[PDB]
Design a protein around this ligand. Structure first.
Ligand SMILES: Nc1nc2c(ncn2[C@@H]2O[C@H](COP(=O)(O)O[C@H]3[C@@H](O)[C@H](n4ccc(=O)[nH]c4=O)O[C@@H]3CO)[C@H]3CC(O)(O)C[C@H]32)c(=O)[nH]1
Length: 396
């Protein structure tokens, strides 16, 4: 018997049911959200949340878009800062504090990202940071220290690739990976409020990956997640969401390591991209459903839910109080990778929160990167196209 079966029974016996639409397809992410919900529904009396999966995050935003045209929205859903911008244009979201959820203790990084015109419209739930995943066995084999700087990372990738007869830095040719190299070469997406995809730090960032592929140290992964490709040739490293931690752990036939990101200098770990989502509450929800929502968002923000959620998944705890929880502390004492993910969460950067950003990162920026990496398009001309499409989409 599965936790979504318990939930189906729990809700059928309930006077009020709050739907939560999500983008967890399977794995520990889906199981930790379901378990959370089971625990919550137990302490209720004919109150409940029903998690409704919708596919991936892009399937979710599309089905929420349609949910609006159709007249029927859930109580709650997962949303990136930029999906929040979109829903705010149609006035669809309740301010979280008017519900009376106490947000003191919530990481200010996470809280600032969900705050529009001084007003919070999301609760940070499943917040991820990019880490350096690596092959402990392979680095030990060649007396290669864990790279601390961009410089050391390129030199180490070249040294292990040469030794093993194939490219050891594995990456997806996507906006998220490009974000790592863009940010840690001084790059920023807004210039005096104008979204810029073709700045010289963009060109340098795409060039680096393209030169990496050409020189035989970087491996573009074109089918599935990196952790779904492990075991086909030598793997030394990947820059990837802390939310992949259980999938890497399940897949790796080598000793898995997690480290902070290489940065420009040893003075600081490089910035990681923040991903995963915030929970929003829809205005269309009834008073009753909104009360379940408030109660559920306080449970989710409770140190124990946050400790269990984050240790079951590798997502970053969103509250100071999660780190003082004994369950957190017990997992951290037997597993240093948790403190490494938290340490990396301090050097965090965000993508723009423009309504059009979901579309831009996938269909325009993502495609420019794929042109460059897979079809050997000039980085500058690839991104210059992107800049033009982005501008056309926005003008619209
Ligand atoms: N819709 C929409 N999506 C966005 C936006 N900005 C970024 N992203 C996506 O967020 C993923 C990161 O969010 P995160 O919670 O850190 O990680 C995800 C999964 O990545 C990860 N996972 C799942 C299965 C697996 O085998 N391995 C694994 O690592 O587990 C989590 C739950 O699915 C990127 C990756 C992507 O899925 O290709 C698309 C990217 C946006 O604005 N909108």
């Amino acid at each position: 018997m599965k936790p979504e079966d318990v939930i189906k029974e729990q809700c059928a016996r309930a006077k009020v049911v709050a739907e939560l639409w999500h983008g967890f397809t399977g794995g520990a992410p889906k199981a930790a959200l379901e378990n959370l919900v089971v625990e919550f529904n137990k302490a209720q009396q004919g109150r409940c949340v029903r998690p409704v999966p919708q596919g991936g995050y892009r399937d979710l935003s599309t089905k929420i878009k349609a949910a609006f045209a159709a007249g029927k929205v859930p109580t709650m859903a997962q949303a990136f800062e930029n999906n929040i911008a979109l829903y705010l244009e149609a006035k669809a979201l309740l301010p979280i504090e008017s519900l009376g959820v106490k947000l003191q203790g919530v990481n200010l990084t996470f809280l600032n990202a969900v705050r529009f015109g001084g007003v919070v419209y999301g609760v940070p739930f499943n917040k991820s940071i990019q880490v350096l995943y690596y092959n402990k066995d392979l680095l030990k084999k060649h007396g290669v220290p864990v790279p601390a700087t961009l410089e050391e990372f390129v030199a180490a990738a070249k040294k292990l690739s040469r030794a093993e007869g194939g490219p050891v830095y594995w990456f997806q040719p996507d906006a998220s990976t490009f974000a790592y190299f863009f940010f840690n070469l001084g790059g920023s997406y807004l210039k005096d409020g104008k979204l810029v995809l073709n700045s010289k730090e963009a060109v340098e960032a795409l060039t680096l990956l393209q030169n990496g592929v050409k020189e035989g140290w970087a491996k573009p992964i074109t089918s599935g997640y990196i952790n779904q490709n492990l075991g086909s040739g030598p793997y030394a490293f990947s820059v990837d969401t802390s939310a992949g931690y259980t999938y890497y752990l399940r897949a790796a036939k080598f000793d898995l390591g997690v480290a902070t990101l290489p940065g420009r200098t040893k003075g600081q770990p490089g910035y990681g991209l923040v991903a995963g989502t915030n929970l929003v509450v829809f205005r269309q929800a009834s008073k009753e459903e909104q009360a379940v929502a408030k109660d559920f968002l306080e449970f989710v923000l409770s140190p124990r839910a946050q400790a269990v959620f984050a240790t079951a998944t590798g997502y970053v705890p969103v509250t100071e109080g999660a780190l003082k929880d004994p369950v957190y502390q017990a997992y951290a004492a037997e597993n240093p990778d948790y403190a490494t993910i938290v340490r990396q969460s301090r050097y965090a950067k965000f993508e723009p929160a423009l309504a059009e950003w979901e579309q831009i990162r996938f269909d325009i920026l993502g495609q420019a990167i794929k042109e460059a990496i897979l079809n050997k398009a000039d980085p500058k001309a690839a991104l210059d196209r992107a800049q033009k499409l982005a501008e056309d989409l926005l003008s619209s």
